[PDB]
Design a protein around this nucleic acid. Structure first.
Ligand code: MG
Ligand code: ZN
Ligand code: ZN
Ligand code: ZN
Lengths: 178, 171, 107, 84, 97, 268, 557, 112
DNA sequence: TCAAGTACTTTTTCCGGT
RNA sequence: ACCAGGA
DNA sequence: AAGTACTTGA
């Protein structure tokens, strides 16, 4: 048995048109902009820049370690060792995907602290760009407004070049110097 | 990319578990099935968020058998790659055909032909490397790849990537 | 209401739905000699209001389909000049309960 | 769409069918080595245990009563009168 | 022995819903097919052993369910298909009421 | 044919009788909401006899020296004479019994008193008498209010339909109509005191038991009344042996909605 | 036993009826279905890659299915296909086809009447799919000309042009599997006198149906997704797998092919003829001949008992079992295999009354109890009892026949080498004998009653008859002039409860049929009860004492 | 309405003449079923079996194949609400015992 | 156009022997 | 599908 | 044997 979503469309007999996915910002049926939370309310898609994603998992796992111990009652190089321990504590271990992801996120995050990840999130979510672009701008580090507009081709007419460069400047400053 | 997605898995509990440690066994059974999973529809199900508030709901007792079916509503962090996605990764393997790059839970392979012409394979190196006039790509080295397409495959998702276009390659 | 002795020519009969909203009823004199509604077997039929009908369906959780039906041509539906969609409340004396009310929608 | 407790309108009493199905279900669960919520006072028949569990009103089950429109009222075996 | 139509009626009259299922399934016929969730047919090439599912025609290697129906019903359906009729089986609703 | 025609009919959780399309057949099962097993032929006393003898049975007139309940009937008998406030209650009572009697004669035109109704009251009183060792000598400890109002209350509790709305509520009132006539007749003030000779405790017990039994008597949602009805007409047809076509052939004639029937007749 | 499948188990909520589009038949199909020959790879007894298994289901029992790897009691069949050389009518839809032609222009595929006729927009308004079609037809049948211009929605002076085509419509009649029309014509205002008479081809009707607009066919009974009119005409024929048409393979080398398999090869053969005639030097009449034969076989395969009499007979004089025939009432799929079924855990013997049995019990002959079984789950409450019943074996009365392991594989106590040293584990099932006081369903057919099927307590006794209390005689309508009765054993705790809680004999005493008891005192007891209770009747102490001890719940007073 | 009245009177007489007594409700229900449609619906293949109930349910009496062919032609959807369909489907029918659902409440289970 | 004929459908309680 | 029986 | 459905003569 597999998992299902909040998307309930009744494709009766009429199979296809299973359209492609790109940086034409055409993602899946599943990864659409208008999503619906289990409370029933329409809620826009949640995309995370590596740094944002690292903290999220850490948070969830740390809180799981709180609940697991409660139920049982009756420096980047150094973050990696500490994370690999929390995984032995909370996760099934067998989940190599999570270990791999965590090692990757630890080694590839641009913003170390929640405070820093906050400013990134505010500064970026004010551009009106699709969560995908907004995350990609957090994940990939770019200098020329071109570097960005090249690697994130969806941006193409969405923002000014100087506007983007101003944002690229503030993101460079925010980078937590390992 | 890297999303938080609201999901729900149907679980069928055997009567022997209708004890007070029920929600406990249920939440754990979910984590077993769901976490570390890899579907194509949602990609890599990596980590179930907010354990303390997983919604078990009421479990309907299946008629001829004793068991109870629960639709465990939950929310989790996912990784779904896309064509056109520019990803930063680390080389893992290297051959005459190209090199594989570890991007999170997933591997992206770059063909000898999807790299600039100047960059050429070197067999006589430890470990095997790719050599440009100015650049050297090998096992420990970091690369920025553009995903050209994916193949949803069982317990994984693999992809072909390129470093031939602008702003791509060794970082 | 038009009361006629023997017949109304199909020439004249074609001018009946001619003047809406206003409605016209043809009644052969010979039928009306005896009031059917007066008969032993004939219970009280009550034409419901639009509001009354709305409530009936609300209270029983019914789609109009799910209600018992009275034919548009029914001697009582004719006596009351029932129009398609209109509902009647039928009050019969029950040997079981003393009083029982059925409902019939028009056809 | 699920009728709220304060707006329920079905019998406050358990039907013959409900009681029969509950006793059936419990016997089936007890027989499948399920945890028993009553003090078996030397009992062995899963049905006789179920009867005892229903008597002590320690059955953790809920009857979902469907109405012809599709809607439903949820009633607990704890709250259901057993005059049957 | 034959648990016939007339016997089925008494069971219906009693309201012995599970007893009836047990006669008609467990005590007789009872079979397991895999159906496709798009075309509600018994098309599925369930290589249950390798966990491979598939329904070419729908190219559905995912949206597949398993169901418990009397073998005689699997038969009836296959027979209706033989005569060009589609008895499409669905595991969810769409009509309401 | 009968079974195949009725199969899908059952009582839903709204006491309504519906088929597999949820179309209403009956609003309430068998027009009363009761299970056929829980019904017994009872006599609706009120219905017959002389207008004269009815009065002797039912009427209580505390403002008349001869038509008052003798103080041998109840303790209050002495102090009840000429009580105008109580005579309002007994006139209400009697005016309803007279109403009932008319309505009953409208339902049952021939005056047939024996009708199957739930809760055999005759038996409840019988038992109250052996249970409480009822002394057909000593005066009762009952008040006129105890009886008059007590019966008015039990009535409010004979529940078939539960909904909080006029439609469903009038539906309940109607469903219970006939039973209440029987109830009001068998539990009128003069009857209770002079005939049954009940004590308060016995009368209170008679009251709880009518309620208990009535409630037990209502049909259970799930009841496959389609098959039941079909089989209840079917089975007897098998035991089947002016001159009109009758029995099995006339039954076949009926169910078929035979246009060209064998013995057409008019009864003028 | 069937194997574990990772697929999510569900229930059927809706059955969406419809028709197969040829495209679908080709898509779902696992093979096509080229040679009438069953198998014998040039007599080499093994299935031919051409008819029954050119990838389909399975024969041999040993040797798995070629598509799913499952094999016999797991593998449902797999459908195939035959591509027909010419279109053919589906016997069933032959008249609906006729009626659709009657409603539409046999040249432009437009509804003969529309929103411009008042009675038509009235009929179109009908919500009921079947009733609407019913009304459209009675209107459109008589419209013998496809109109170009009809009078406007205001005045007859100005005529508004609807759809084009001014062609005259044929007067269609059936000629047994053939649709033949008769167009009046015009010729100097008259003609007919003598109209044009020609058969309407399957392909021409197909092309008209193909041209009927979605909006139009949807006004008629049709559905643009599940049943388009173009699908009533067969192009690509689905081939049912062996499970549908199993060979009754006697001995080792002796075929025994099904009736459906032969009728299919007939179609196959009739198709190959046609295809080669049109591919080769087409002698024009030779084709409308071989075509009419293929139409015949495709018709008779589905329904053999057609009005235009000539029944397709098997070489024996005996006619061919149609698919229609398979499904038709009482005996046959619906009524005989689905509404009613032969069942396991059933017993039948001669009944005889017993005054020493209790009202609610039933005397069960030892032999019957020793056969009939209940699958009891090894629980700590019964572990010891069950271990002894197993020890006891299938031959002794309180004993068992099988032990079901966690693994799912059945242990036969009759033969297992480890039948003694068997060591029970919680969660195993022990298939024990039918024992005293188990609830069982007792029945006496006809069964015109709720009461004809009652739940009784078991009572294992000697002698080959079912024993019943005399007062329970009436509900069943039983007597002992040689009546036999049926017993059914529930297999679950769930079903056991259903019986004991709803169907039990005591519960059945007062019947809702007539609001009075359906069981009373009878025969000897009714006779002796009068005799005992006369004023004249007195009993001496000696007997009184025995009469007293006989009442099982006598106070001892 | 008077049609129903007569229909009962007549049905009742067939039973009563034979001596037999059947409780009102049974005859009432049959009589009502024939009536609720608007007219006199026969207990034949032309009457009740031609109603808008489920194809499979209807196919189980008198016209089997013919009914099923029409189901295909009109692309009928069986609701699967009737007894007969569930019987055919080998499912628990929404009959008495199956007229409601049973669920485990984790809350009360953690309470006992 | 409306009555009369023709087609053609359709059922029948459960348990040795070709 | 037939034939012969049983309640 | 008894209906529906459709076709045929006045
Ligand atoms: Mg006999
Ligand atoms: Zn499919
Ligand atoms: Zn296979
Ligand atoms: Zn045209």
């Amino acid at each position: 048995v597999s998992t299902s979503t909040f998307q309930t469309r009744r494709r009766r007999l009429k199979k296809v048109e299973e359209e492609e996915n790109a940086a034409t910002l055409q993602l899946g049926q599943e990864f659409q902009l208008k999503q619906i939370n289990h409370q029933g309310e329409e809620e826009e898609l949640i995309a995370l820049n590596l740094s944002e994603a690292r903290l999220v998992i850490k948070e969830a796992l740390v809180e799981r370690r709180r609940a697991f111990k409660r139920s049982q009652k009756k420096t980047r190089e150094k973050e990696l060792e500490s994370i690999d321990v929390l995984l032995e504590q909370t996760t099934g271990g067998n989940n190599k995907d999570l270990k791999n992801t965590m090692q990757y996120l630890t080694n590839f995050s641009r913003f170390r602290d929640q405070e820093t990840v906050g400013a990134v999130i505010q500064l970026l979510k004010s551009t009106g760009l699709h969560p995908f672009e907004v995350a990609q701008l957090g994940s990939l580090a770019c200098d020329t407004a071109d570097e960005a507009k090249t690697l994130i081709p969806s941006l193409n007419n969405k923002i000014s070049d100087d506007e983007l460069e101003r944002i690229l400047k503030e993101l460079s400053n925010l980078e937590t110097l390992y | 990319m890297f999303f938080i997605k609201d999901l729900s898995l149907n679980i069928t509990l055997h009567p022997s578990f209708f004890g007070p440690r029920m929600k406990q066994y249920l939440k754990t059974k979910l984590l077993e099935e769901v976490e570390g999973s890899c579907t194509g529809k949602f990609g890599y199900i990596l980590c179930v968020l907010d354990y303390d508030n997983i919604d078990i709901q009421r479990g309907r007792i299946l008629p001829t058998d004793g068991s109870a079916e629960f639709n465990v509503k939950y929310r989790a962090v996912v990784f779904k790659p896309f064509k056109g996605e520019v990803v930063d990764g680390t080389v893992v393997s290297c051959s005459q055909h190209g090199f594989e790059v570890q991007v999170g839970p997933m591997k992206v392979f770059v063909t000898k032909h999807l790299m600039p012409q100047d960059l050429t394979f070197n067999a006589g190196s430890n470990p095997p490397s790719y050599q440009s006039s100015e650049d050297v790509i090998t096992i420990k080295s970091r690369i920025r790849v553009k995903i050209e397409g994916c193949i949803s495959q069982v317990s994984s998702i693999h992809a072909i990537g390129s470093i031939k276009e602008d702003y791509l390659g060794a970082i | 209401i038009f009361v006629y002795q023997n017949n109304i020519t199909p020439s004249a009969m074609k001018l009946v739905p001619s003047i809406p909203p206003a409605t016209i009823e043809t009644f052969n004199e010979a039928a009306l000699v005896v009031n059917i509604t007066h008969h032993e077997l004939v219970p009280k039929h009550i034409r419901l209001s639009s509001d009354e009908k709305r409530e009936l369906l609300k209270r029983y959780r019914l789609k109009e389909s799910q209600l018992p039906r009275i034919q548009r041509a029914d001697p009582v539906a004719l006596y009351l000049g029932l129009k398609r969609g209109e509902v009647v409340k039928i009050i019969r004396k029950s040997e079981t309960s003393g009083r029982y009310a059925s409902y019939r929608i028009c056809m | 769409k699920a009728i709220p407790k304060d707006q329920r309108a079905t019998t406050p009493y358990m039907t013959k069918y409900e009681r029969a199905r509950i006793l059936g279900t419990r016997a089936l669960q007890i027989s499948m080595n399920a945890p028993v919520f009553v003090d078996l006072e030397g009992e062995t028949d899963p049905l006789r245990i179920a009867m005892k569990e229903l008597a002590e009103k320690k059955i953790p089950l809920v009857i979902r009563r469907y109405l012809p429109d599709g809607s439903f009222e949820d009633w607990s075996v704890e709250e259901l009168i057993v005059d049957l | 022995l034959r648990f016939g139509e007339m016997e089925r009626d008494c069971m219906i009259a009693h309201g012995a819903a599970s007893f009836l299922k047990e006669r008609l399934m467990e005590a007789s016929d009872a079979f397991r097919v895999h159906i496709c969730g798009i075309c509600g047919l018994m098309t599925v090439i369930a290589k249950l052993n390798h966990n491979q599912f598939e329904c070419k025609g729908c190219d559905n290697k995912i949206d597949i369910y398993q169901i418990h129906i009397p073998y005689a019903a699997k038969l009836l359906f296959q027979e209706l298909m033989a005569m060009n009729i589609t008895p499409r089986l669905y595991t969810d609703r769409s009509r309401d009421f | 044919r009968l079974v195949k025609a009725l199969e899908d009919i059952m009582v839903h959780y709204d006491n309504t009788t519906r088929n597999s399309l949820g179309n209403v057949i009956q609003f309430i099962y068998g027009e009363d909401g009761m299970d056929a097993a829980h019904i017994e032929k009872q006599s609706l006393d009120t219905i017959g006899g002389s207008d004269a003898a009815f009065e002797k049975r039912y009427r209580v007139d505390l403002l008349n020296t001869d038509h008052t309940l003798d103080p041998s009937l109840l303790e209050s008998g002495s102090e009840i004479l000429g009580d105008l406030k109580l005579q309002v209650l007994l006139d209400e009572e009697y005016k309803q019994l007279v109403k009932d009697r008319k309505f009953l004669r409208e339902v049952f035109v021939d005056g047939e008193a024996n009708w199957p109704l739930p809760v055999n009251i005759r038996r409840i009183i019988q038992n109250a008498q052996q249970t409480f060792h009822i002394d057909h000598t000593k005066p009762s400890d009952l008040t006129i209010k105890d009886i008059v109002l007590g019966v008015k209350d039990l009535q409010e509790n004979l529940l078939v339909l539960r909904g909080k709305n006029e439609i469903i509520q009038n539906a309940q009132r109607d469903a219970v109509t006939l039973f209440c006539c029987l109830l009001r007749s068998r539990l009128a003030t003069r009857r209770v005191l002079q005939e049954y000779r009940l004590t308060k405790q016995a009368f209170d017990w008679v009251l709880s038991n009518i309620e208990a039994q009535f409630l037990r008597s209502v049909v259970h949602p799930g009841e496959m009344v389609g098959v039941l009805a079909a089989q209840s007409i079917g089975e007897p047809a098998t035991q089947m042996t002016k001159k009109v076509t009758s029995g099995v052939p006339r039954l076949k004639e009926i169910l078929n909605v035979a246009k060209n029937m064998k013995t057409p007749s008019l009864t003028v | 036993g069937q194997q574990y499948s990772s697929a999510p188990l569900r229930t059927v909520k809706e059955v969406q009826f419809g028709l197969f589009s040829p495209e679908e038949v080709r898509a779902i199909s696992v093979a096509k279905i080229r040679f009438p020959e069953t198998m014998d790879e040039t007599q080499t007894r093994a299935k031919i890659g051409g008819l029954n298994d050119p990838r389909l289901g399975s024969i041999d029992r040993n040797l798995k299915c070629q598509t799913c790897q499952e094999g016999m009691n797991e593998c449902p069949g797999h459908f195939g296909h035959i591509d027909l050389a010419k279109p053919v009518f589906h016997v069933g839809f032959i008249a609906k086809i006729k009626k659709v032609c009657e409603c539409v222009c046999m040249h432009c595929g437009k509804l003969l009447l529309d929103e411009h006729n008042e009675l038509m927009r009235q009929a179109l308004a009908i919500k009921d799919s079947k009733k609407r079609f019913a009304a459209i037809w009675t209107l459109c049948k008589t419209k013998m000309v496809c109109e170009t211009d009809v009078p406007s929605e205001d005045d007859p002076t100005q005529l508004v042009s609807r759809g084009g085509c001014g062609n005259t419509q044929p007067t269609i009649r059936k000629d047994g599997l053939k649709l033949v029309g008769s167009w009046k014509k015009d010729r100097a205002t008259g003609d007919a006198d003598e109209p044009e008479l020609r058969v309407l081809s399957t392909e021409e009707i197909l092309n008209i149906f193909k041209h009927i607009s979605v909006k139009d066919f949807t006004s008629l009974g049709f559905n643009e997704v599940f049943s388009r009119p173009e699908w009533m005409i067969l192009t690509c024929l689905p081939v049912p797998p062996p499970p549908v048409r199993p060979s009754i393979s006697f001995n080792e080398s002796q075929r025994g092919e099904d009736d459906l398999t032969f009728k299919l090869a007939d179609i196959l053969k009739a198709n190959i003829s046609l295809e080669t005639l049109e591919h080769n030097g087409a002698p024009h009449h030779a084709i409308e001949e071989a075509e009419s034969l293929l139409q015949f076989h495709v018709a008779t395969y589905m329904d053999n008992d057609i009005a235009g009499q000539p029944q397709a007979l098997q070489k024996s004089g005996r006619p061919v079992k149609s698919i229609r025939a398979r499904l038709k009432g009482k005996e046959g799929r619906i009524r005989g295999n689905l509404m009613g079924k032969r069942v396991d855990f059933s017993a039948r013997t001669v009944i005889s009354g017993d005054p020493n049995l209790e009202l609610d019990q039933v005397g069960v002959p030892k032999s019957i109890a020793k056969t009939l079984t209940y699958p009891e789950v090894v629980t700590p409450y019964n572990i010891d009892r069950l271990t002894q019943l197993v020890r006891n074996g299938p031959n002794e009365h309180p004993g068992a026949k099988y032990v079901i392991r966690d693994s799912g594989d059945r242990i036969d106590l009759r033969y297992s080498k480890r039948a003694g040293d068997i060591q029970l584990q919680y969660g195993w099932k022990v298939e024990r004998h039918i024992m005293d006081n188990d609830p069982v369903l007792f029945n006496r057919q006809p069964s015109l009653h709720k009461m004809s099927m009652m739940a009784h307590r078991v009572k294992v006794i000697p002698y080959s008859t079912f024993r019943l209390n005399l007062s329970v005689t009436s509900p069943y309508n039983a007597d002992f002039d040689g009546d036999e009765m049926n017993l059914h054993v529930p297999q679950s705790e769930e079903t056991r409860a259903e019986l004991s809680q709803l169907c039990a004999v005591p519960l059945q005493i007062v019947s809702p049929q007539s609001n009075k008891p359906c069981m009373g005192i009878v025969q000897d007891t009714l006779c002796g009860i009068r005799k005992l209770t006369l004023r004249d009747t007195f009993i001496e102490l000696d007997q009184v004492l025995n009469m007293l001890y006989w009442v099982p719940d006598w106070d001892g007073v | 309405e008077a049609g129903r009245a007569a229909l009962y009177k007549e049905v009742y007489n067939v039973i009563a003449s034979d001596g037999s007594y059947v409780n009102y409700r049974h005859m009432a229900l049959l009589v009502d079923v024939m009536t609720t449609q608007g007219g006199l619906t026969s207990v034949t293949r032309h009457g009740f079996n031609r109603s808008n109930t489920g194809a499979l349910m209807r196919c189980s009496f008198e016209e089997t194949v013919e009914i099923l062919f029409e189901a295909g032609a009109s692309a009928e959807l069986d609701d699967c609400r009737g007894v007969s369909e569930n019987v055919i489907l080998g499912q628990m029918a929404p009959i008495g015992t199956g007229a409601f659902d049973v669920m485990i409440d984790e809350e009360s289970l953690v309470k006992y």
